[PDB]
Ligand SMILES: CN(C[C@@H](O)Cn1ccnc1)c1ccc(Cl)cc1
């Protein structure tokens with residue numbers, strides 16, 4: 001039912017944006033069909049974790065506060081696709097980093113996807129009292145992610161920034177704000193229950209959940225094989241500021257740091273394997289278990305602090321934090 | 326006085342955005358100074374024709390309708406830098422089209438510049454009654470330009486679209502909406518005189534002025550030498566849908582079209598020179614003079630239709646259409 005409605009609203013969103021181009025933007029059918037295939041390629045395929053999070057938070061606040069139900073759930077789906085389209089916009093910008101018409105179309109696709117988040121919001125929320133509030137929080141969160149991408153890309157140019165606090169800074173701005181905090185806020189906006197929740201505790205929960213999931217992704221990037229991870233682990237080659245790096249540098253000897261610095265960031269298969277051996281010999285995956293446990297217990301505690309003033313809100317977070325575990 | 330105030334507001338805008346990053350975004354001084362040098366590089370340098378247009382329209386409506394004067398002119402400068410920053414955002418995206426950290430920073434710069442237009446608007450216009458109206462027209466015009474870039478980049482893939490009406494479609498969406506229509510509207514918004522002007526006639530004036538200036542740029546791209554034009558003429562090599570191409574194809578013989586199609590879009594110096602020879606032998610620069618004259622007379626006529634309901638508005642357009650001619 002949640003996914004079946006989310007995909008049905010996608011059809012409603014897509015046919016509006018494409019008809020608007022046809023009727024109000026002088027676009028020819030060939031380019032309309034081209035943009036249909038592009039929209040389906042970049043936006044459809046993922047697990048829709050950010051989009052469905054908005055709907056799961058919205059439906060809890062309705063029955064735990066009737067034509068208002070039909071409107072709030074539809075607004076949640078539009079806000080859900082605003083994030084998914086924004087995610088597609090970020091992914092397209094990532095493809096460019098790694099008279100050529102195929103690169104011009106990639107840049108133009110990234111601009112179109114980002115603009116479509118504004119267009120679907122300005123249309124479906126034209127008579128909603130929160131259109132100005134939603135667009136401002138959406139723009140600021142987008143600005144936050146761009147700042148977070150600067151912290152990550154330049155985390156090795158100016159190993160001084162390989163610290164646990166700067167790692168949190170990267171995860172906070174680059175990932176946590178738009179993946180965890182943004183969908184939760186959108187569930188409170190369409191339900192008209194934003195000032196009824198502790199924003200500080202909700203903020204703190206989003207950063208901790210982002211930290212938990214980013215540490216797990218860093219370990220899986222290095223140790224999970226390609227066929228089981230779904231991609232190729234590239235953090236060691238790209239010299240990223242991963243949780244495995246900042247944890248190793250703290251508990252490594254002066255020689256292990258020298259052997260780490262002389263092999264990190266290289267593309268050579270043997271230098272990358274040398275980095276994995278140091279991670280293995282340092283018992284980092286033993287520290288990974290205890291680190292995620294302490295973070296998980298912080299998530300369990302702050303959910304209780306939020307339910308004293310927002311019971312149904314924490315119920316969605318519990319089911320969303322629980323999920324596949 | 327206009328430029329001296331415009332640059333002074335730039336200092337006010339820059340120091341806010343950089344301090345906000347320092348105070349509210351956990352940014353270190355090194356990256357703050359990096360973003361200062363990036364902001365000055367991409368935004369400062371041009372002639373500021375779009376930004377100053379907003380101020381010239383605003384100051385006319387004040388004296389031709391006193392603490393309100395100081396506020397409207399400051400709002401005009403902020404709107405002026407919103408367009409200039411948006412122009413820098415488009416230029417940065419153009420540099421990308423023609424683990425590499427220098428390309429990641431270019432993409433990140435394009436996202437930051439675009440986000441800065443929202444941030445300066447959400448701050449300086451926080452208590453203005455037109456913040457929601459301004460952001461929506463700004464976003465739609467930005468969406469319009471992205472659509473116009475699709476018409477231009479794909480104007481030779483799907484010589485069928487080399488027609489005078491499709492050329493106007495490219496100029497209208499890619500250039501005219503944000504270079505001419507957008508600054509004029511921003512002068513009416515900060516002056517609170519938007520519904521007091523004929524939007525249709527104002528729209529028609531912006532498209533005609535964009536058409537006049539785009540035809541002149543196409544001819545200069547092909548005939549003006551590099552040291553006098555300021556760049557290198559690349560339209561013939563890039564196989565662009567320029568005014569010289571669509572005019573030639575109409576008045577060329579069946580052999581001249583064959584000789585044009587077999588040499589257009591190539592990078593060979595002799596094939597490009599063959600295209601220029603056909604443009605010369607077709608007496609196109611004789612048609613260019615009469616074509617700009619007919620367009621110029623349309624601009625002179627529609628200014629009069631607008632002054633019957635907006636005298637001071639047309640006074641700025643006359644001085645702005647007059648300018649260097
Ligand atoms: C977006 N999302 C699911 C995703 O982050 C989990 N994941 C996927 C890959 N690694 C971790 C999510 C959103 C809100 C809440 Cl409360 C909980 C989870």
Ligand SMILES: CN(C[C@@H](O)Cn1ccnc1)c1ccc(Cl)cc1
Pocket residue numbers: 374375378504505508534538542641642645646
């Ligand atoms: C932006 N601009 C000046 C620029 O277009 C002229 N130009 C520059 C290069 N080729 C042509 C402008 C804006 C509003 C009006 Cl009403 C008139 C002119």
